[PDB]
Amino acid sequence: DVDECSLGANPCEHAGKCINTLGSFECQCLQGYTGPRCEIDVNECVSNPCQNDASCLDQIGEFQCICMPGYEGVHCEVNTDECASSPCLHNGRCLDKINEFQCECPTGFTGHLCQVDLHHI
Ligand SMILES: [Ca+2]
Ligand SMILES: [Ca+2]
Ligand SMILES: [Ca+2]
């Protein structure tokens, strides 16, 4: 027949590589594109990749997750460790929460960070 890849413009959309065949042609699409002529912008959010109630952004050849507060990572799969800096004073036990921490203060200590000494009273 004809070499559709040699007529002038690339018959493959979105800079796909045109490969000639006898009787037709084929397109080798760049990441994020699909269809016989790469016409379609793939929806990278279609498989629900964003975890923990994150918002998914469908972009060119990728998705981006917008995490709920307290979450991080590409899929918002990481619950940020708020206990990392050891915030509890006087032997308080740190419990990691969502965008927060809890200190389990020993007897005689109170306050968010176990700051208040009550032993003298
Ligand atoms: Ca052809
Ligand atoms: Ca896309
Ligand atoms: Ca946390």
Swiss-Prot record:
Glycans are attached at S24, S47, S55, S85. The record marks D58 as: Interaction with DLL4. Ca(2+) 1 binds at T21, S24. Residues 9-10, 37-41 are annotated as: Interaction with DLL4. Disulfide bonds join C5-C18, C12-C27, C29-C38, C45-C56, C50-C65, C67-C76, C83-C94, C88-C103, C105-C114. Ca(2+) 2 binds at D41, V42, E44, D58, Q59. Residues 1-39, 41-77, 79-115 form the EGF-like domain. Synthesized in the endoplasmic reticulum as an inactive form which is proteolytically cleaved by a furin-like convertase in the trans-Golgi network before it reaches the plasma membrane to yield an active, ligand-accessible form. Cleavage results in a C-terminal fragment N(TM) and a N-terminal fragment N(EC). Following ligand binding, it is cleaved by ADAM17 to yield a membrane-associated intermediate fragment called notch extracellular truncation (NEXT). Phosphorylated. In fetal tissues most abundant in spleen, brain stem and lung. Also present in most adult tissues where it is found mainly in lymphoid tissues. Ca(2+) 3 binds at N79, T80, E82, D96, K97. It is found in: Cell membrane; Late endosome membrane. It comes from the Eukaryota. Heterodimer of a C-terminal fragment N(TM) and an N-terminal fragment N(EC) which are probably linked by disulfide bonds. Interacts with DNER, DTX1, DTX2 and RBPJ/RBPSUH. Also interacts with MAML1, MAML2 and MAML3 which act as transcriptional coactivators for NOTCH1. The NOTCH1 intracellular domain interacts with SNW1; the interaction involves multimerized NOTCH1 NICD and is implicated in a formation of an intermediate preactivation complex which associates with DNA-bound CBF-1/RBPJ. The activated membrane-bound form interacts with AAK1 which promotes NOTCH1 stabilization. Functions as a receptor for membrane-bound ligands Jagged-1 (JAG1), Jagged-2 (JAG2) and Delta-1 (DLL1) to regulate cell-fate determination. Upon ligand activation through the released notch intracellular domain (NICD) it forms a transcriptional activator complex with RBPJ/RBPSUH and activates genes of the enhancer of split locus. Affects the implementation of differentiation, proliferation and apoptotic programs. Involved in angiogenesis; negatively regulates endothelial cell proliferation and migration and angiogenic sprouting. Interaction with PSEN1 causes partial unwinding of the transmembrane helix, facilitating access to the scissile peptide bond. It is linked to Aortic valve disease 1: A common defect in the aortic valve in which two rather than three leaflets are present. It is often associated with aortic valve calcification, stenosis and insufficiency. In extreme cases, the blood flow may be so restricted that the left ventricle fails to grow, resulting in hypoplastic left heart syndrome. Adams-Oliver syndrome 5: A form of Adams-Oliver syndrome, a disorder characterized by the congenital absence of skin (aplasia cutis congenita) in combination with transverse limb defects. Aplasia cutis congenita can be located anywhere on the body, but in the vast majority of the cases, it is present on the posterior parietal region where it is often associated with an underlying defect of the parietal bones. Limb abnormalities are typically limb truncation defects affecting the distal phalanges or entire digits (true ectrodactyly). Belongs to the NOTCH family. This is Neurogenic locus notch homolog protein 1. The gene is NOTCH1. The chain holds residues 412 to 526 of 2555 of the full protein.
